[PDB]
Design an enzyme around this catalytic site. Structure first.
Site, PDB file in Angstrom:
ATOM      1  N   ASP A  42       0.864  -1.174   0.000  1.00 52.23           N
ATOM      2  CA  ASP A  42       0.000   0.000   0.000  1.00 52.23           C
ATOM      3  C   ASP A  42       0.906   1.230   0.000  1.00 52.23           C
ATOM      4  OD1 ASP A  42      -1.686  -2.129   0.556  1.00 52.23           O
ATOM      5  OD2 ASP A  42      -2.147  -1.485   2.603  1.00 52.23           O
ATOM      6  N   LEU A  43       2.200   0.998  -0.193  1.00 49.03           N
ATOM      7  CA  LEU A  43       3.183   2.069  -0.161  1.00 49.03           C
ATOM      8  C   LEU A  43       3.040   2.738   1.216  1.00 49.03           C
ATOM      9  CD1 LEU A  43       4.275   1.391  -2.668  1.00 49.03           C
ATOM     10  CD2 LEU A  43       2.566   2.814  -3.763  1.00 49.03           C
ATOM     11  N   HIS A  65       8.958  -2.686   3.668  1.00 49.36           N
ATOM     12  CA  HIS A  65       8.428  -2.994   4.992  1.00 49.36           C
ATOM     13  C   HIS A  65       7.173  -3.863   4.822  1.00 49.36           C
ATOM     14  CE1 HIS A  65       6.243  -1.943   8.850  1.00 49.36           C
ATOM     15  NE2 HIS A  65       7.445  -2.227   9.318  1.00 49.36           N
ATOM     16  N   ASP A  66       6.352  -3.530   3.829  1.00 50.77           N
ATOM     17  CA  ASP A  66       5.144  -4.304   3.540  1.00 50.77           C
ATOM     18  C   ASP A  66       5.557  -5.711   3.131  1.00 50.77           C
ATOM     19  OD1 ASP A  66       3.229  -2.435   4.082  1.00 50.77           O
ATOM     20  OD2 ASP A  66       2.913  -1.833   2.000  1.00 50.77           O
ATOM     21  N   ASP A  70      11.016  -3.727  11.222  1.00 48.59           N
ATOM     22  CA  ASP A  70      10.740  -2.353  11.616  1.00 48.59           C
ATOM     23  C   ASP A  70      12.029  -1.539  11.567  1.00 48.59           C
ATOM     24  OD1 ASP A  70       8.078  -2.880  11.998  1.00 48.59           O
ATOM     25  OD2 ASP A  70       8.191  -3.022  14.184  1.00 48.59           O
TER      26      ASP A  70
END
Length: 122
Positions: free
Chosen positions: A43-44, A64-65, A85
């Site tokens: 989802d950017l 990260h997604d 993270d």
């Protein structure tokens, strides 16, 4: 999937610049990695906090997604969440080194805010 999928996934999710660089090349050639059946959806930074100065963090968010979604798919999310993270924070900090003075400080501040907003979950 291939036998080395767990190792490939680990290689794409380290905090180092080389890990980000390896992932970026894969992201641009996702089809070449079709055998691994990775979840390439993202989802950017649409679910991230505000970015008033508009620093280009989309790719940081995308990796990260990738880390979250694929480790959740492997059923080993809790133990890898911290590194993912942290890698996210390092990716954003790399963007910030391209700025000086106030902008550099503002960029690092936004990076910290983004990081803290995901760190709050555990």
């Amino acid at each position: 999937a291939p036998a080395d999928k767990p190792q490939v996934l680990a290689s794409f999710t380290q905090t180092s610049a080389s890990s980000q660089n390896a992932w970026l090349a894969a992201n641009r050639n996702q089809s070449a990695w079709a055998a691994y059946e990775f979840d390439w959806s993202t989802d950017l930074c649409t679910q991230a906090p505000d970015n008033p100065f508009g620093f280009p963090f989309n790719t940081a968010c995308a990796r990260h997604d990738f880390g979250y979604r694929n480790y959740k798919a492997a059923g080993s999310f809790d133990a890898n969440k911290s590194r993912i993270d942290s890698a996210f924070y390092e990716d954003m900090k790399r963007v910030c080194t391209g700025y000086t003075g106030e902008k550099n400080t503002a960029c690092n501040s936004t990076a910290w805010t983004y990081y803290q907003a995901v760190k709050i979950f555990g």
